[PDB]
Amino acid sequence: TYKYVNLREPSMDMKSVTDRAAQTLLWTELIRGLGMTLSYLFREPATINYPFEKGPLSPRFRGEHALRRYPSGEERCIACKLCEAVCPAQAITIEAEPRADGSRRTTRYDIDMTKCIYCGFCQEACPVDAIVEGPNFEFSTETHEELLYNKEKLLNNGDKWEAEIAANIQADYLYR
């Protein structure tokens, strides 16, 4: 159930000794290595053409966060603070009060995108699928505070990417 790597006693007959001396003088394994390199010279390379092509992904991908909505216009977030409770980086800050129709909604929903570790506990802790971690990963910014999303940027990302996040959750929610 175990094997001995490098426990080969080489043969000491004049045929194999002449073969190893020919390997030493005439460099057989060097030509073998150069031949393997030459065999990779004549292949199709695996360089995809970004940004006109895109790297392959899955519908489970963890990218930019967003707050979704029902198919009636109402925002899903009912201010229940599970997403900031299970947040391992404590990137989420939630401050809530009843709004003008008495419904339990947030007033501050901040996800610090530089504390956030993109592990997706908030998309699985949210009982109403309000916060989701959508498809976008090309949201690099030139300044640090543009990576401190408030509620407004997350609702705008939800309105931006809803046409994709709805199909991804539609394809994926049977596993969850």
């Binding site: 409770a85 404590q90 800050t93 610090d112």
Partner: protein, 208 residues
């Protein structure tokens, strides 16, 4: 109890109880308690004067043969007067087993270094100097190994806070990365999560 509950290994429990009685009745000078956990692991709680004479037994004895030092660990507990709980974990490759040797100290009592028995601890208890402040006499290069060079204090003591007492920022005045008192932009929000209902009745502590 068939799908989800862990299968109990009574063989390991009986063999570790026999070997715990063995190590107890050989060394009554240093071995204080011998316990076997419910998940079949052995713990030999000893006195800090027996760091070398216990381990040198377990490194050498023909029915111990714990040749490997897997992990040396200190656990700080503030409510005890001997607050540091230094934990030796030993692996015997021939007897296919592990033992745990648990000693104790406060901040000022030195614990004897075990580099003469296992050289592997040459960093580990050295780390216990850096992370806890437990001094290990007769150690060759005992100095800090994980913290920064200008770090005053010992981090993994539980009276040391989560964020430190200094932060580093670059400063263009003196053209230098300097240390200033920390002011967190967001406070570390501590969550009082301990539910007041008794989760495990078999671990109940009897009252005063």
């Amino acid at each position: 109890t068939r799908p989800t509950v862990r299968p109990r290994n009574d063989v390991a429990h009986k063999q570790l109880s026999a070997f715990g009685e063995y190590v107890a009745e050989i060394l009554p000078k240093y071995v204080q308690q011998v316990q076997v956990s419910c998940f079949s692991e052995l713990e030999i709680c000893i006195h800090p004067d027996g760091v070398i004479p216990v381990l040198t037994f377990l490194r050498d004895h023909s029915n111990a043969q714990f040749k490997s030092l897997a992990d040396l660990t200190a656990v700080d507990i503030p409510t005890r007067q001997n607050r540091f709980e230094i934990v030796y974990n030993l692996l015997s490759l021939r007897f296919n087993s592990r033992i745990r040797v648990k000693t104790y100290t406060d901040e000022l009592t030195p614990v004897e270094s075990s580099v003469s028995v296992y050289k592997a601890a040459n960093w580990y208890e050295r780390e216990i100097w850096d992370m806890f402040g437990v001094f290990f006499a007769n150690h060759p290069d005992l100095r800090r190994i994980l913290t920064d060079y200008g770090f005053e204090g010992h981090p993994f003591r539980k009276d040391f806070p989560l964020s430190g007492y200094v932060e580093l920022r670059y400063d263009d005045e003196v053209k230098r990365v300097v240390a200033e008192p920390v002011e967190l932009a967001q406070e570390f929000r501590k969550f009082d999560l301990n539910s007041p209902w008794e989760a495990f009745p078999a671990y109940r502590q009897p009252p005063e």
